[PDB]
Design a protein around this ligand. Structure first.
Ligand SMILES: *[C@@H]1O[C@H](CO)[C@@H](O[C@@H]2O[C@H](CO)[C@@H](O[C@@H]3O[C@H](CO)[C@@H](O)[C@H](O[C@@H]4O[C@H](CO)[C@@H](O)[C@H](O)[C@@H]4O)[C@@H]3O)[C@H](O)[C@H]2NC(C)=O)[C@H](O)[C@H]1NC(C)=O
Ligand SMILES: *[C@@H]1O[C@H](CO)[C@@H](O[C@@H]2O[C@H](CO)[C@@H](O[C@@H]3O[C@H](CO)[C@@H](O)[C@H](O[C@@H]4O[C@H](CO)[C@@H](O)[C@H](O)[C@@H]4O)[C@@H]3O)[C@H](O)[C@H]2NC(C)=O)[C@H](O)[C@H]1NC(C)=O
Ligand SMILES: *[C@@H]1O[C@H](CO)[C@@H](O[C@@H]2O[C@H](CO)[C@@H](O)[C@H](O)[C@H]2NC(C)=O)[C@H](O)[C@H]1NC(C)=O
Ligand SMILES: *[C@@H]1O[C@H](CO)[C@@H](O[C@@H]2O[C@H](CO)[C@@H](O)[C@H](O)[C@H]2NC(C)=O)[C@H](O)[C@H]1NC(C)=O
Ligand SMILES: *[C@@H]1O[C@H](CO)[C@@H](O[C@@H]2O[C@H](CO)[C@@H](O)[C@H](O)[C@H]2NC(C)=O)[C@H](O)[C@H]1NC(C)=O
Ligand SMILES: *[C@@H]1O[C@H](CO)[C@@H](O[C@@H]2O[C@H](CO)[C@@H](O)[C@H](O)[C@H]2NC(C)=O)[C@H](O)[C@H]1NC(C)=O
Ligand code: 5Q1
Ligand code: 5Q1
Ligand code: NAG
Ligand code: NAG
Ligand code: NAG
Ligand code: NAG
Ligand code: NAG
Ligand code: NAG
Ligand code: NAG
Ligand code: NAG
Ligand code: CA
Ligand code: CA
Ligand code: CL
Ligand code: CL
Ligand code: ZN
Ligand code: ZN
Ligand code: ZN
Ligand code: ZN
Lengths: 686, 686
């Protein structure tokens, strides 16, 4: 009973069976169907052999369209007539036109409203897009409806950016330039987005809070909830998404200024005029939104399975991914959840033969991830003390594939070595690499920008269920999935089905199987290796990289750094110290008795934990990791030394430079202190 | 080598020698003399046999009078003449009239100013005193100088209360009714306060922040400091203390309303008129303060000694007390520090013979405790990650005696059993109890208000160096000292000398020796017992007591609890659960292998830690313990369920009752959740 045994028990055919089983009806959070799937998963995980399997439920704020009062957008003429209306549903996929309860496209958590106004086209609605509109083009968004294309950044950042600019409404759409791959056919004949396809998705700005009504505390039966008016993260203007057929109708009459350059033009046969408003003929027509969605406190259910550790049952390695989907979830998330199900099945087969892992493994099927990571965050708020004193690692398990080209890993530097070592022992599934390792194919296809002969591994960002574990609690975290050659066209649409995956992404299920071996093999090592498989020297390498980068951003303002005596010396000193201490620690780790071992492993487990500042980042108390936080411009992207980065952002625009530069210095001191403090956790303990 | 060996090595004669050595010159924080004593202590602890002994220094905000521009108060006539002036120094004690650098009486951190006005007498300046003045007597303090007597509550709460009432100055004084014991002579002929004696002391309201300029982070060499304007906890009006000779001069001319009752009258031959202002003859005279003290960032030094553990070197038991004193520190703190020095000496004797404790013991000599607990708090901010993952217990060691009657212990319920068991094995030093245990004499003299045949043990409050460890970090903490039959007259005066202790408090040093056996024996057990000597069942008992108490406070408002559906059921359910789970845990602890042991001990060590809410209490982010916080009316006193207590305080005065009662419910939910969460840390781990 070893890792090879675990890995050999995983079967592509089983992943395929489970994916099919998980994707025949929609499993939207808060619905009957998703409770039923949770019950099924709990039953099967027990049958698979876990020691215990429980549902953990919470009553959280969710959001749904009004069934009898649909959401839509109009062009209205001056007479008041609605002369063009967007579509009320996506044409359902072949063979699914009778499935009940497909939720129509909507932006979850939109407030209600029927605003009317002139359209302004804001490109991707990124921070830089609004800067370009307002500062360079002198175009004023206040009181206008903005239309923005999806992509580049999390949609919630788009809405926040629109709000701050004074917009009274947001219309989101998928441009073929971003969601239609050239040379491939639309679903059902290929994997491309049809013009009637629409990306659903929440538009919250929770900054890691979880349920908007109970930030800090689990939404259990006796919770005291904020009123809607004080809820965290809800947008203050109506928002609705549409497909590119409808978008074309809204964009074609656009007047005002031309697009500032070609980076602002998508693929529709439309000028991409920024506005405000329409051209001459139609300058009297307007855009009207009709949004009637309601926010509703609704029960959600996590499935939590436990495989007790033989030696350190009080040390937890967690494999977690969500189960709730927008409609059928053929990729998002069931391609990940089917992989988790087969991982549980394999571990349980070993267990039934008398094996147990050294440490406890917890398996999680999270609910309401699509509505703001609510299920993972509420459970972690409930269990925060257990997690912070016992949590070894968290491996996420959302969609296993978003392409069929190569591997994509985003993790803490603590697991870089683990990931290199594991992938060297796994067979590549790729054409042209038969008989060669996954490591070889991945490094060949996705080389490191810095080191020859190594693969790219990215920082963790946010916007998935690892966020509370890593960014709030400081538990070492990672994720891995197959990706494209550098999202995917049918993301969050009704066309993400079992057939999309089985026909176009992974017909042999070999990419699913490889991802199962990576996620499963990581959890196996973390739960069974005698010494935890973390290399602190890898952190010392990246900290230097990030310190160089942040210093180079500051050095765009040399005169201000002289005037205000802005020095990075403390941060560099801390990083140098971390490097030296980590080096000594690594020598002792190889050169040593279970208390020494357990004292040692605790140093490795609490090293990620040491980067947490209990005071949080400014105005973001649930983002506490001083090295990594979600980017303030794009929740999906990771930022390093985010406190310093945000202090320096757009600093030349601040009215009181002394105060702005003071706050940069304050952030340098906080970062330097935290790096040194983390380093000292690796010093000899007495 | 066992506890008896440790205890027998402690000698009364050595405590006496060290006390004498520590009290011949003043050791005010930030001065040359106190750095020299720190160096001496470090040298001796090394000689005593500790493994390492370091100074940990920080640059913190301190406050000192201006040497060439003394602080004083006047009665000024309408002509502008200063017709009476308070004294510029206390008459120094016999044989010490040539000692240099005795700091004159002042209120540390007072701002500068020379306000003039009418006096109002505010009794003890407690919350209830100001309520009585303003609501019942209709006396308006705005723009008036208040005169208040020391006692009952921390002086800082007095100043905060005066500020909030609109006072422009505060004069603090020691009334004989509170600081002169009947039938005993004044120093040097007895232990009573002479009329020229004055209590020094800081008047900050830091709420656990430590150095006013660097809340959250150590005041190290690269720290970025707040400006004085944003500093935490500084008073906004001038404050100065005086003795009762001077107080009599200021109080004798007082007019306006009579004292509302006899609880408002002290012992001076004065009417205790509340004012405002003086009687007819002198109604045109005024009181003028002259305060010229300056706040100065100043280096302070902690001495940190380590005795490495043989088995769990990564588990810390800390014995810490301060070294800085107002003048000679004959009781405060050197009676405690001399005890610590002899404890270190005894442990080092065992070490020199080849013994080591099971866990690491850390010994601390803290600086600048008198200026706001700055040395212990900065070191704990520096080492917070080590402390929270490794800190087993903190035993404080300030003044060993404040009387010669009986023992006084204030601790976490987790150490109640430890304290009972230890004191049953110690000989009582008391007259009439020769041959009988310390337990027997203490319970006889200070019985429990609740259980026959047990002694009183009180909650921890704050205002001493355990505050950061217990209230911020959640490390189990305790303190013990000999006390009077229910502060002490010469507290913080120049008369607290070696002679006061050797002549009047403890001439045989037997009370010092007994306190050394208690503090030392507690640290020995905590550092050496195989299973940590904490009983979680004791916590379950007090939690029920506190839940009953807080419910009984709320039930003063039955109509409001019906209207707003204010239920305590969740809190009672949590406490019941904690009781049941603790009971099972205790059974397993007696019924079990070093990992099981270490997994078990970790449950005991992290149990205090589980009562910490990382979000802090409302507007008090550094007070994080949900069960215990310093009282918002008296930093010295402990409050239980302080979040709920403060929500209910004076609630019938709140203008929006729906909102006030909502916040009571929110606090009940937070408390219930935290109790249940702490209970679940004692559940089986998987
Ligand atoms: C990386 O690791 C280093 C440990 O090897 C550590 O070095 C410490 O650095 C601090 C400076 O930040 C040193 O502080 C000095 O301590 C001595 C006493 O040991 C003091 O005398 C000295 O006094 C001052 O001199 C100042 C500087 O010129 C002056 O401004 C002051 O007013 C005062 O006169 C300093 O406070 C400490 O000793 C060092 N330990 C060593 C060298 O072994 C680094 O700080 C660490 N990096 C970080 C970010 O922590
Ligand atoms: C002390 O320890 C107890 C464990 O023995 C624990 O008991 C749990 O209590 C909660 C109630 O707070 C129970 O919650 C219910 O869970 C079931 C499913 O297991 C739900 O069906 C049920 O649904 C609801 O019924 C509600 C109440 O009438 C209603 O308002 C809702 O809308 C919904 O229909 C409840 O959510 C849980 O099962 C209990 N575990 C048990 C009994 O074993 C205590 O909560 C704990 N005390 C604290 C403060 O944690
Ligand atoms: C997915 O697979 C499960 C497990 O086999 C199916 O659930 C079972 O359905 C059978 C036949 O109705 C019942 O006898 C069992 O009680 C079910 N087992 C459970 C819930 O654990 C489930 O119906 C399948 N779903 C689809 C769409 O094929
Ligand atoms: C990844 O594999 C490398 C090569 O096997 C491991 O590094 C070796 O670890 C052993 C065990 O301590 C050492 O004795 C060798 O000297 C190491 N070889 C090196 C550094 O080249 C590495 O530990 C593995 N990473 C893990 C387990 O996280
Ligand atoms: C307190 O005791 C210490 C320790 O004996 C005395 O310090 C020593 O003084 C002698 C005589 O001057 C020196 O030779 C040593 O170098 C000192 N030892 C140290 C500093 O560790 C100290 O002087 C005593 N103080 C008083 C007031 O009696
Ligand atoms: C205090 O002393 C009592 C009496 O010795 C200790 O309680 C006993 O502990 C032993 C060891 O587990 C048990 O076998 C006995 O049943 C206990 N006696 C009781 C409960 O009456 C108690 O453990 C000690 N407290 C400590 C060490 O914190
Ligand atoms: O939908 C999500 C969050 C974002 C997805 C990543 C993602 C983010 C954006 C796109 C897109 O714009 O097409 C596609 C995928 C993840 O982290 O798995 N979770 O279910
Ligand atoms: O002076 C102090 C803080 C308060 C003291 C307790 C104390 C508190 C008040 C008095 C008094 O009013 O006479 C006396 C003693 C302690 O906690 O040791 N620390 O050095
Ligand atoms: C949906 O449709 C209409 C909107 O006014 C109304 O009858 C019904 O209350 C709505 N449902 C909600 C708000 O859940
Ligand atoms: C848009 O829908 C509204 C409401 O149902 C209707 O009055 C109008 O005729 C529609 N416009 C078009 C072009 O269908
Ligand atoms: C832009 O928007 C509206 C135009 O109606 C105007 O009232 C507002 O004050 C303008 N503000 C800025 C900052 O340009
Ligand atoms: C699957 O891989 C092939 C081979 O390169 C590629 O052409 C095709 O685009 C891939 N399918 C998807 C959905 O990426
Ligand atoms: C103390 O005395 C006077 C007050 O104005 C002045 O000469 C000197 O600056 C003062 N010292 C300080 C502020 O430290
Ligand atoms: C009080 O002191 C001031 C300043 O030194 C002086 O002018 C005045 O004479 C003094 N008053 C008395 C009564 O000594
Ligand atoms: C009380 O104080 C002063 C008296 O000069 C007055 O100006 C102030 O407004 C009064 N306020 C209250 C609340 O009684
Ligand atoms: C010391 O104890 C005696 C004996 O009861 C008592 O009368 C005296 O007041 C005590 N001294 C002090 C300072 O308490
Ligand atoms: Ca919550
Ligand atoms: Ca500080
Ligand atoms: Cl993932
Ligand atoms: Cl004490
Ligand atoms: Zn997903
Ligand atoms: Zn998704
Ligand atoms: Zn003291
Ligand atoms: Zn004191």
């Amino acid at each position: 009973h070893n890792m090879k045994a675990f890995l050999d028990e995983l079967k592509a055919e089983n992943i395929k069976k489970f994916l099919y089983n998980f994707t025949q009806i929609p499993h939207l959070a808060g619905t009957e169907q998703n409770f039923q799937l949770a019950k099924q998963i709990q039953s099967q995980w027990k049958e698979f052999g876990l020691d215990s399997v429980e549902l953990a439920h919470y009553d959280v704020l969710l959001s749904y369209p009004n069934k009898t009062h649909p959401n839509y957008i109009s062009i209205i003429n001056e007479d008041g007539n609605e002369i063009f209306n967007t579509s009320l549903f996506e044409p359902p996929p072949p063979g699914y036109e009778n499935v009940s309860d497909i939720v129509p496209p909507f932006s979850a958590f939109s407030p209600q409203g029927m605003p009317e106004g002139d359209l302004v086209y804001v490109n991707y609605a990124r921070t830089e897009d609004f800067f370009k509109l307002e500062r360079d083009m002198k175009i004023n968004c206040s009181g206008k409806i903005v239309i923005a294309r999806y992509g580049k950044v999390f949609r919630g950042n788009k809405v926040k950016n629109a709000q701050l600019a004074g917009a009274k409404g947001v219309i989101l759409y998928s441009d073929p330039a971003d969601y239609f791959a050239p040379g491939v056919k639309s679903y059902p004949d290929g994997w491309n987005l049809p013009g009637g396809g629409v990306q659903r998705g929440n538009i919250l700005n929770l900054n890691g809070a979880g349920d908007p009504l109970t930030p800090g505390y689990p939404a259990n039966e006796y919770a005291y909830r904020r009123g809607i008016a004080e809820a965290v993260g809800l947008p203050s203007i109506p928002v609705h998404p549409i497909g590119y057929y409808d978008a074309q109708k809204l964009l074609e009459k656009m007047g005002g200024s031309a697009p500032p350059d070609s980076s602002w033009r998508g693929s529709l046969k439309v000028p991409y005029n920024v506005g405000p408003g329409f051209t001459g003929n139609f300058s009297t027509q307007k855009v009207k939104m009709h949004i009637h969605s309601t926010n509703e406190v609704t029960r959600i259910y996590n499935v939590i399975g436990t495989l007790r550790g033989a030696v350190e049952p009080d040390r937890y390695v967690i494999l977690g991914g969500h189960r709730d989907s927008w409609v059928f979830g053929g990729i998002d998330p069931q391609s990940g959840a089917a992989v988790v199900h087969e991982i549980v099945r394999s571990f349980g087969t070993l267990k039934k033969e008398g094996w147990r892992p050294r440490r406890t493994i917890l398996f999680a099927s999270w609910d309401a991830e699509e509505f703001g990571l609510l299920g993972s965050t509420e459970w972690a708020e409930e269990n925060s003390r257990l997690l912070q004193e016992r949590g070894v690692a968290y491996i996420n398990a959302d969609s296993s594939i978003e392409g069929n080209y190569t591997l994509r890993v985003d993790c803490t530097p603590l697991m870089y070595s683990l990931v290199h070592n594991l992938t060297k022992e796994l067979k590549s599934p790729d054409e042209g690499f038969e008989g060669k390792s996954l490591y070889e194919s991945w490094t060949k296809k996705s080389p490191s920008p810095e080191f020859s002969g190594m693969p790219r591994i990215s920082k963790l960002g946010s916007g998935n269920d690892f966020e509370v574990f890593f960014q709030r609690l400081g538990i070492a975290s990672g994720r891995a999935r197959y990706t494209k050659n550098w999202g995917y066209p049918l993301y969050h649409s009704v066309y993400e089905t079992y057939e999309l995956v089985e026909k176009f992404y992974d017909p042999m299920f070999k990419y699913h199987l490889t991802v199962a071996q990576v996620r499963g093999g990581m959890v196996f090592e973390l739960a069974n290796s005698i010494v935890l498989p973390f290399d602190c020297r890898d952190y010392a390498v990246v900290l230097r990289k990030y310190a160089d980068k942040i210093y180079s951003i500051s050095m765009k303002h040399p005169q201000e750094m002289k005037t205000y005596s802005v020095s990075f010396d403390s941060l560099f000193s801390a990083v140098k110290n971390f490097t030296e201490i980590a080096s000594k620690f690594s020598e002792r780790l190889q050169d040593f008795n279970p208390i020494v071992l357990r004292m040692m492993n605790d140093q490795l487990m609490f090293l990620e934990r040491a980067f947490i500042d209990p005071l949080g980042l400014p105005d973001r108390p649930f983002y506490r990791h001083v090295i990594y936080a979600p980017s303030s411009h794009n929740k999906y992207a990771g930022e390093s030394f985010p406190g310093i980065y945000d202090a320096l952002f757009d600093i030349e625009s601040k009215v009181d430079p002394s105060k702005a530069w003071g706050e940069v210095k304050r952030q340098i001191y906080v970062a330097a202190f935290t790096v040194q403090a983390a380093a000292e956790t690796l010093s000899e303990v007495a």
